[PDB]
Amino acid sequence: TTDGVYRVMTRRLLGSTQVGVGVMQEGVFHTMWHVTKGAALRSGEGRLDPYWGDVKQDLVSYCGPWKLDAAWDGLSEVQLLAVPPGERAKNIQTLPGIFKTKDGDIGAVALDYPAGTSGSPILDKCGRVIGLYGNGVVIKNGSYVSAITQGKRE
Amino acid sequence: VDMYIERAGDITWEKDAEVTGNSPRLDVALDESGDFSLV
Ligand SMILES: CCCC[C@@H]1NC(=O)[C@H](CCCCN)NC(=O)Cc2cccc(c2)CNC(=O)CNC(=O)[C@H](NC(=N)N)CCCCNC1=O
């Protein structure tokens, strides 16, 4: 459980598929629910058990409660640290747009990556994780916009 | 199914990074299952 960004992989009898990405911080693994469906993970020889999650937020944490507390400031540019299948991590800077909902505004990034990039962290300028990439919408021309999805550190 | 994790890098902001993408203003609904849909 060393700090960093990780690929989430599945394999059966043949090769592996990258289904997503997540963040290890403070001994807890953080990813999107749709990546793991809330099931247990292997890390080397160890097992990581689901601890907290919420399907409406599309989030799940392993080993402990959600630790990522930084918030988008509602103003500044951010970076997606994209970890696409078969490619090394890369930083993409963008000025978020906004998902306007009946319950308030959520920052959203107009950046389009493969499905298995889900869970890649979005960063503020201090390198803090302000949310995870990959729960979004497809707009009229077929391009993609992802919410900056962040949980609550209780 | 063996679902497992593999380390892929450090989490660091990149100075002088490539900037891209617009800043769309979208009306969306979030359902109880976690689906976002355009209104
Ligand atoms: C429950 C599981 C959620 C899974 C989640 N999908 C999403 O948020 C959206 C939600 C749409 C609104 C729902 N109310 N789901 C899609 O985008 C599906 C989709 C739709 C049209 C076409 C394609 C894929 C083909 N694209 C790819 O095969 C790779 N790219 C893509 O798949 C998307 N880009 C694109 N231009 N369509 C980028 C996906 C980024 C990671 N997130 C996801 O995979």
> Can you tell me the distance from the alpha carbon of A36 to that of A82, in angstroms, rounded to the nearest whole number?
18
Contact A99, A147 (CB under 8 A): yes
Partner A contacted by B16 (CB < 8 A): no
The full DSSP string for A72-121 is --SSS-EEEEE--TTS--EEEEE--EEEEETTEEEEEE-----GGGTT-E
Q: What are phi and psi of A65, to 5 degrees?
A: -70, 160
Domain count, chain B: 1
Q: Provide the 8-state DSSP code for B34.
A: S
CB A79 within 8 A of CB A72: no
Q: Give me the domain span that covers residue B39.
A: 2-39
Domain boundaries defined on chain A? 1-68, 69-154
Give the up-direction half-sphere exposure of residue A146: CA atoms within 13 A in the CB hemisphere: 28
B6 closest CA partner among A115, A54, A116, A66 = A116
The closest alpha carbon to A119, from A8, A19, A4, A31, belongs to A31
Which amino acid appears at position A85 of this protein? P
* Contact: B11, A81; criterion CB under 8 Å: yes
What is the distance between the alpha carbons of residues A43 and A153, in angstroms, rounded to a whole number? 23
CB of B18 sitting under 6 A from ligand 1: no
Q: Give the containing element (helix H, strand E) for A24.
A: strand A16-25
Q: How was this structure determined?
A: X-ray
Question: Does A125 reach chain B within 8 Å, measured CB to CB?
Answer: yes
